[PDB]
Amino acid sequence: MNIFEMLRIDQGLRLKIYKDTEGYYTIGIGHLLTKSPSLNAAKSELDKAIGRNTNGVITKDEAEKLFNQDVDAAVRGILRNAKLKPVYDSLDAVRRAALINMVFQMGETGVAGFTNSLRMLQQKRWDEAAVNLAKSRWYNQTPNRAKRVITTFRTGTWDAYGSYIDELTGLFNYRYLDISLDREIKRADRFGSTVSMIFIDLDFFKGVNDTHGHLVGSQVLNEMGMLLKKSVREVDIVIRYGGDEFTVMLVETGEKGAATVAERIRRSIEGHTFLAAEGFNIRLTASLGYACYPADTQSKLELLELADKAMYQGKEQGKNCVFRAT
Ligand SMILES: Nc1nc2c(ncn2[C@@H]2O[C@H](CO)[C@@H](O)[C@H]2O)c(=O)[nH]1
Numbered sequence: 581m582n583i584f585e586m587l588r589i590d591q592g593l594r595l596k597i598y599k600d601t602e603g604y605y606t607i608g609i610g611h612l613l614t615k616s617p618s619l620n621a622a623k624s625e626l627d628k629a630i631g632r633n634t635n636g637v638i639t640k641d642e643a644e645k646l647f648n649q650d651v652d653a654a655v656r657g658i659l660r661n662a663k664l665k666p667v668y669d670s671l672d673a674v675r676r677a678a679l680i681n682m683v684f685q686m687g688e689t690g691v692a693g694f695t696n697s698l699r700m701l702q703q704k705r706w707d708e709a710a711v712n713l714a715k716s717r718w719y720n721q722t723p724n725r726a727k728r729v730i731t732t733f734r735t736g737t738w739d740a741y742g743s744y745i746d747e748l749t750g751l752f753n754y755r756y757l758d759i760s761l762d763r764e765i766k767r768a769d770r771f772g773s774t775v776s777m778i779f780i781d782l783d784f785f786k787g788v789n790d791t792h793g794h795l796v797g798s799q800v801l802n803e804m805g806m807l808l809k810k811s812v813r814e815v816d817i818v819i820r821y822g823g824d825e826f827t828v829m830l831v832e833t834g835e836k837g838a839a840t841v842a843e844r845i846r847r848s849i850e851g852h853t854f855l856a857a858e859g860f861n862i863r864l865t866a867s868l869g870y871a872c873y874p875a876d877t878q879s880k881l882e883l884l885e886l887a888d889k890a891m892y893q894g895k896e897q898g899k900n901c902v903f904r905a906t
């Protein structure tokens with residue numbers, strides 16, 4: 581965990597322009613391009629910011645450079661702010677990340693208005709700072725993010741963000757499904773775009789544990805996570821759940837893209853030899869099901885239900901297959 585991954589959890593990563601909660605054109609890890617209603621003005625600013633003719637689309641490397649520029653500007657502003665500089669200078673690196681996080685969300689002036697919280701932070705009175713931080717419009721507006729940021733100030737650890745990471749595979753875990761889904765569905769609702777969910781369940785995975793032992797099976801799941809990430813884009817969200825069950829949430833594409841990605845995943849699993857560098861010859865297939873929002877449903881919960889039912893239909897009809905919700 582680090583400040584990039586922390587803000588990616590809180591703000592997502594997007595490689596095409598989207599609209600934030602106020603309707604403002606944004607890209608990357610929460611980089612506001614403009615408040616202008618003009619998409620053209622947003623694209624002209626994006627080209628200046630990246631230093632390329634982007635037509636509204638950037639690479640992950642570009643988004644992370646833009647993010648680092650935004651962190652540097654937040655720190656330089658903190659250091660020029662008489663109320664924030666002494667607190668920042670006094671904090672350790674993790675708690676500085678929490679302060680920067682607040683500046684990303686609400687701006688420097690907003691953070692500087694946390695008079696009593698800042699006092700307690702400068703005095704290392706962590707529990708009192710956490711109580712004071714929650715007495716704010718910020719906490720009420722975004723309580724889940726504020727609780728994470730507050731826990732980071734209270735503890736000085738990354739644990740509130742690490743609890744979204746699956747230890748075995750390094751993928752996101754089931755706790756991230758709520759956050760990521762709610763966020764990309766809302767962004768799609770504002771923008772008129774599509775979100776698709778793909779459920780993937782390995783076929784006969786118990787047979788790997790039976791033949792090679794559970795430690796080998798766990799390494800197969802780790803390699804499966806790597807293969808899924810290689811098969812999708814950096815804006816797509818890959819989660820493990822549980823056991824040999826994974827989800828992929830597709831962002832920034834449509835129904836045709838969902839079909840293409842699900843078929844690519846199925847084919848890539850079927851063609852892959854697992855643990856080959858360790859001398860194994862493990863072969864697997866998977867059953868996949870997917871559904872698209874808003875085409876197939878206008879309920880996020882139903883979207884999950886339909887993709888899972890489509891996957892199970894594949895399981896019942898021979899496995900090694902992809903079904904879209906009917
Ligand atoms: N090796 C291994 N097997 C698992 C893990 N999680 C679930 N499983 C097994 O995968 C099978 C899925 O049906 C079940 O027997 C689970 O016990 C894991 O982390 N490692």
Ligand SMILES: [Mg+2]
Pocket residue numbers: 781782783784785786824
């Ligand atoms: Mg299975």
